[PDB]
């Protein structure tokens, strides 16, 4: 395991989908939010569903 800062790991995962890494660093707050919100919807779905 080689440590790497999580925002720089996500910048490489953006290169892996053909989106240039500056698109992450220039939008990082908006990608960190909306990830956090999409995880909150997993809790709400699993809490409410049957």
């Amino acid at each position: 395991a080689l440590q790497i800062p999580f925002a720089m790991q996500m910048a490489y995962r953006f290169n892996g989908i053909g989106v240039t890494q500056n698109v992450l660093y220039e939008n990082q707050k908006l990608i960190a939010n909306q990830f956090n919100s999409a995880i909150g919807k997993i809790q709400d779905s699993l809490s409410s569903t049957a």
């Binding site: 800062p5 925002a7 720089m8 490489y12 240039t20 500056n22 660093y25 220039e26 990082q28």
Partner: protein, 57 residues
């Protein structure tokens, strides 16, 4: 442009990510996008422009 910016504690280099091979940072090792105002964790350092000393003649 491809690789990582790293520092040995005093100087900044760009390396490929899967093997440590450091290069001096240059205007063709790298690409520009926007101001320094936006990026969380940007650092201040020189970028060498290889054309400028040639075009000085």
């Amino acid at each position: 442009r491809e690789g990582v910016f790293v520092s040995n504690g005093t100087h900044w280099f760009v390396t490929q990510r899967n093997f440590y091979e450091p290069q001096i940072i240059t205007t063709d090792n790298t690409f520009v996008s926007g101001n320094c105002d936006v990026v969380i964790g940007i650092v201040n350092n020189t970028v060498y422009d290889p054309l400028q000393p040639e075009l000085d003649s």
